Amino acid sequence: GPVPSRARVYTDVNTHRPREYWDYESHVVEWGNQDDYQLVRKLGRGKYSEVFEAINITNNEKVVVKILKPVKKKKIKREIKILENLRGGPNIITLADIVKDPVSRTPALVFEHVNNTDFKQLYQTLTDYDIRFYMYEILKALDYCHSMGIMHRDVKPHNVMIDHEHRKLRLIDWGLAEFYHPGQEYNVRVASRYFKGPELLVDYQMYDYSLDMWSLGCMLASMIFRKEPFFHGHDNYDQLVRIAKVLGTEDLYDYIDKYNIELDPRFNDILGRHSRKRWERFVHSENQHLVSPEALDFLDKLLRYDHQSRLTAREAMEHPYFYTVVKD
Numbered sequence: 001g002p003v004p005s006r007a008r009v010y011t012d013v014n015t016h017r018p019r020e021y022w023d024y025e026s027h028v029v030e031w032g033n034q035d036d037y038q039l040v041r042k043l044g045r046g047k048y049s050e051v052f053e054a055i056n057i058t059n060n061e062k063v064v065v066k067i068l069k070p071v072k073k074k075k076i077k078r079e080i081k082i083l084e085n086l087r088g089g090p091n092i093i094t095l096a097d098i099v100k101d102p103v104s105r106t107p108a109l110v111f112e113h114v115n116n117t118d119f120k121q122l123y124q125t126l127t128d129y130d131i132r133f134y135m136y137e138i139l140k141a142l143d144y145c146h147s148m149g150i151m152h153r154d155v156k157p158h159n160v161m162i163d164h165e166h167r168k169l170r171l172i173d174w175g176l177a178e179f180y181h182p183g184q185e186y187n188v189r190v191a192s193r194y195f196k197g198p199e200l201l202v203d204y205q206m207y208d209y210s211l212d213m214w215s216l217g218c219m220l221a222s223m224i225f226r227k228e229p230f231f232h233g234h235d236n237y238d239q240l241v242r243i244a245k246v247l248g249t250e251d252l253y254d255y256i257d258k259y260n261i262e263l264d265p266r267f268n269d270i271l272g273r274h275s276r277k278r279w280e281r282f283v284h285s286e287n288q289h290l291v292s293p294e295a296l297d298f299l300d301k302l303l304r305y306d307h308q309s310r311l312t313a314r315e316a317m318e319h320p321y322f323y324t325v326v327k328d
């Protein structure tokens with residue numbers, strides 16, 4: 001069978017927390033007053049929820065309300081418990097309230113509001129300095145949640161809310177997040193296709209916080225090279241082929257051989273043989289102002305097949321790429 005794996009950091013955080021910290025199935029939800037919140041505008045819909053701009057009429061402040069679609073009670077409790085555990089942490093979206101929606105007959109999560117700009121428009125304008133700054137802000141959120149025993153598992157541009165006017169960033173959508181427990185096997189049907197780590201694509205279930213670092217590297221690659229998404233697969237099999245055309249097939253085989261993993265035999269006709277590429281190949285006259293030797297080395301250290309070889313969030317914050325970012 002497969003060789004087991006452990007996180008190289010924050011391995012035992014949940015073991016030594018009180019059980020109530022991670023035992024979300026036992027969590028008792030504290031409900032607020034549903035009439036405190038008046039819906040104003042629908043912002044989006046998905047398979048799991050609908051999201052609205054709203055007003056909190058006890059302070060006349062904007063909030064965001066996520067009205068959950070019917071899903072299993074443990075997954076609702078998991079997201080609620082994670083949001084409560086992380087509340088107040090650096091750049092973590094604040095859960096302000098939880099109320100029972102009378103129409104949906106489901107919980108509605110009330111969040112602080114971010115006056116954000118759309119990433120499809122924001123990424124057109126961010127400077128080299130902007131990208132370094134906001135990457136550092138994301139890392140603060142990821143090191144925090146990892147240090148608190150939680151992996152996000154859905155890092156992608158859509159889940160990073162940026163108020164560019166105030167240089168404010170929030171990591172949102174903790175609905176796929178999980179508590180890390182050493183030796184636990186997790187569902188690989190997490191993250192969006194373009195941000196799925198190799199561990200998910202080869203069906204290796206004993207993964208950890210380092211999944212979020214692959215996803216972050218995918219975001220970084222798309223920003224500095226001006227190609228969004230960077231690894232643009234047509235499905236989950238082609239996604240791994242796209243990765244292998246950049247990182248090469250020999251190191252993919254080294255990865256699965258290390259963990260005594262077999263590829264799906266359907267890769268026999270589609271994977272091919274590919275050398276590992278040098279990152280300079282993706283530099284051109286229209287992105288070179290976003291690229292530096294520091295950026296390429298940082299990217300190279302995030303995008304590793306072996307989840308055990310990727311930079312941790314704290315290690316990433318030590319990288320020379322961030323030396324030019326003004327510290328607070």
Ligand SMILES: COc1ccc(/C=C2\S/C(=N\c3cccc(C)c3)NC2=O)cc1O
Pocket residue numbers: 044045046047049050051064066093111112113114115116161172173174175
């Ligand atoms: C505009 O400011 C905000 C925008 C979103 C959030 C929090 C969210 S939105 C989410 N999930 C979805 C995202 C897109 C579509 C759908 C249906 C659900 N999960 C969260 O925590 C908080 C904000 O302040």
